[PDB]
Design a protein around this motif. Structure first.
Motif, PDB file in Angstrom:
ATOM      1  N   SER A  34      38.090  45.618   1.632  1.00 60.21           N
ATOM      2  CA  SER A  34      36.751  45.319   2.133  1.00 60.21           C
ATOM      3  C   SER A  34      36.728  45.355   3.660  1.00 60.21           C
ATOM      4  CB  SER A  34      36.308  43.942   1.639  1.00 60.21           C
ATOM      5  OG  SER A  34      37.121  42.917   2.188  1.00 60.21           O
ATOM      6  N   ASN A  78      29.797  40.175   0.096  1.00 58.60           N
ATOM      7  CA  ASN A  78      31.098  40.501   0.668  1.00 58.60           C
ATOM      8  C   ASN A  78      32.131  40.880  -0.389  1.00 58.60           C
ATOM      9  OD1 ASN A  78      31.441  37.884  -0.330  1.00 58.60           O
ATOM     10  ND2 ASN A  78      31.326  36.977   1.724  1.00 58.60           N
ATOM     11  N   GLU A 122      43.470  43.447  -0.059  1.00 61.80           N
ATOM     12  CA  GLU A 122      43.560  42.154  -0.715  1.00 61.80           C
ATOM     13  C   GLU A 122      44.064  42.332  -2.147  1.00 61.80           C
ATOM     14  OE1 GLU A 122      39.843  40.143  -0.424  1.00 61.80           O
ATOM     15  OE2 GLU A 122      40.730  38.139  -0.533  1.00 61.80           O
ATOM     16  N   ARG A 152      41.864  45.281  -3.803  1.00 63.49           N
ATOM     17  CA  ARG A 152      40.601  45.707  -3.204  1.00 63.49           C
ATOM     18  C   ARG A 152      40.694  45.797  -1.683  1.00 63.49           C
ATOM     19  NH1 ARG A 152      36.021  40.839  -3.294  1.00 63.49           N
ATOM     20  NH2 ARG A 152      37.179  39.386  -1.943  1.00 63.49           N
ATOM     21  N   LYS A 182      37.896  41.520   4.871  1.00 59.40           N
ATOM     22  CA  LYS A 182      39.234  41.001   4.595  1.00 59.40           C
ATOM     23  C   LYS A 182      40.304  42.079   4.399  1.00 59.40           C
ATOM     24  CE  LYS A 182      38.757  36.227   3.024  1.00 59.40           C
ATOM     25  NZ  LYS A 182      39.374  35.210   2.122  1.00 59.40           N
TER      26      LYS A 182
END
Ligand SMILES: *[C@@H]1O[C@H](CO)[C@@H](O)[C@H](O)[C@H]1NC(C)=O
Lengths: 12, 220, 212
Positions: free
Chosen positions: B40, B88, B46, B38, B43
């Motif tokens: 985001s 998030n 990930e 993923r 972050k």
């Protein structure tokens, strides 16, 4: 930097 | 060729679960493992986990408690499921395949699935024409476009003439209005002489709300 | 986990030039590093695997080097199509982790924007909202000013801007400025003007229309 979910690019 | 096609984007409520299907072709799930990554704003990229060709799964430690990955070899589908989503967790989710059956260098990627975690409601956009005129025609070049307004959540795909018109096209990044809904414009420049003979249609597809609109744009 | 630091954050170059990306690890990872490219609205694209090994379908101008903690992705002659973000990934330690990325911007010659203005559609007015769109097309550099005036009154706070990412073909930007007002207010005024300021303009460009 911050990733942009709209353009899939880094926005500094 | 090798392809990974993911299920469409959508809205997920807080504390609810996320489901994404990854359909693969050009290879067998009995030969290769499928990874989930993923991306985001907070972050970045990930690595989440992986389902191996044998059926074994590994999950990144902060996700081990709320992640589960399954698959149907015969149907060439991999199933991603994550529980108790929070704000998030809003990100783009990818499924991917490596070059070799055991490695982690991701040579093939899915198109990504933008998952938005909010308490709001899904709303389709209204589409209004940005008509070409003298106020938008200089040197034989006319500009026209579509106003894609008041939708949620992202994303929305805009194409022109069912994909036949790509050059001169600018689909602007969405902006968030005070209402909490997104709005954008998609424009294209064309020869003004073609305005009388060519039809110009923007194809709007807001997958989260299953809203498909074709908007004809004419001079006024 | 292994912390990967990419430096610098932004990187601006000119076409034909050679450019290097840096990826540094918190501790030694041998040559177990991979590089990726992310173009606008795209998924990551594997550029280099294991520090230096090349990938099928990837242009020869992409190379990599390094071992231990200091790694380098290089493009010997940058093209406009190279406008993207670049990420490194380690897999010497579990779990595999990614760096934060480096943004590659391209320089080009100054290009003045073409300015077009769009009055609200009668279709939109049926809803009770008016959007006036001002388009600044194909310009460089990114910086531009858009001033809205309605009946000679300076508008402030009631417009939103959006800028495209850099074009992969000609390296320009396009901008949209959208003035939004109620149908009532829109009908209470006549002259709507959009004034554009840019480096490539020897004079501010004003696009305007009279309602009706
Ligand atoms: C979101 O918040 C959680 C705590 O609820 C925190 O542990 C995590 O770092 C955040 N997630 C991201 C990906 O930003």
């Amino acid at each position: 930097x911050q990733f942009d979910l709209s353009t899939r690019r880094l926005r500094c | 060729q090798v392809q990974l096609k993911q299920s469409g984007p959508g809205l997920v409520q807080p504390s609810q679960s996320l489901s994404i299907t990854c359909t693969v072709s050009g290879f067998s799930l009995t030969n290769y493992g499928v990874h989930w990554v993923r991306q985001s704003p907070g972050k970045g990229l990930e690595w989440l986990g992986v389902i191996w060709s044998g059926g074994n799964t590994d999950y990144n430690t902060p996700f081990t408690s709320r992640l589960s990955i399954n698959k149907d070899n015969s149907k060439s589908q991999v199933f991603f499921k994550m529980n108790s989503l929070q704000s998030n967790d809003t990100a783009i989710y990818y499924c991917a395949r490596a070059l070799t059956y055991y490695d982690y260098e991701f040579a093939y990627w899915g198109q990504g699935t933008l998952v938005t975690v909010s308490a709001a409601s899904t709303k389709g956009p209204s589409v209004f024409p940005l008509a070409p005129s003298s106020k938008s025609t200089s040197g034989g070049t006319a500009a026209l476009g579509c106003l894609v307004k008041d939708y949620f959540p992202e994303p929305v795909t805009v194409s022109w003439n069912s994909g036949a018109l790509t050059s001169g096209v600018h689909t602007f990044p969405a902006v968030l209005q005070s209402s909490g809904l997104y709005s954008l414009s998609s424009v294209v420049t064309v020869p003004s002489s073609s305005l009388g003979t060519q039809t110009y249609i923007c194809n709007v597809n807001h997958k989260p709300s299953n809203t498909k609109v074709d908007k004809r744009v004419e001079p006024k | 986990d292994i912390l990967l630091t990419q430096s610098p954050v932004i990187l601006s170059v000119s076409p034909g030039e050679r450019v290097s990306f840096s990826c540094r690890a918190s501790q030694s990872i041998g040559t177990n590093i991979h590089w990726y490219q992310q173009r606008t609205n795209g998924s990551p694209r594997l550029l280099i695997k294991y520090a230096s090994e090349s990938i099928s379908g990837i242009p020869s101008r992409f190379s990599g080097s390094g071992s231990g903690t200091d790694f380098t992705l290089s493009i010997n002659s940058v093209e406009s199509e190279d406008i993207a973000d670049y990420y490194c990934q380690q897999n010497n330690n579990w779990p595999t982790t990614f760096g934060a990325g480096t943004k590659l911007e391209l320089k080009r010659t100054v290009a003045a924007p073409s300015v077009f203005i769009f009055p609200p559609s009668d279709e939109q007015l049926k809803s009770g909202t008016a959007s006036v769109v001002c388009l600044l097309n194909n310009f460089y550099p990114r910086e531009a000013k858009v001033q809205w005036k309605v009946d000679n009154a300076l508008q402030s706070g009631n417009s939103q801007e959006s800028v495209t990412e850099q074009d992969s073909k000609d390296s320009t930007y396009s901008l949209s400025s959208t003035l939004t007002l109620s149908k009532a207010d829109y009908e209470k005024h006549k002259v709507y003007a959009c004034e554009v300021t840019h480096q490539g303009l020897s004079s501010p460009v004003t696009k305007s229309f009279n309602r009706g």
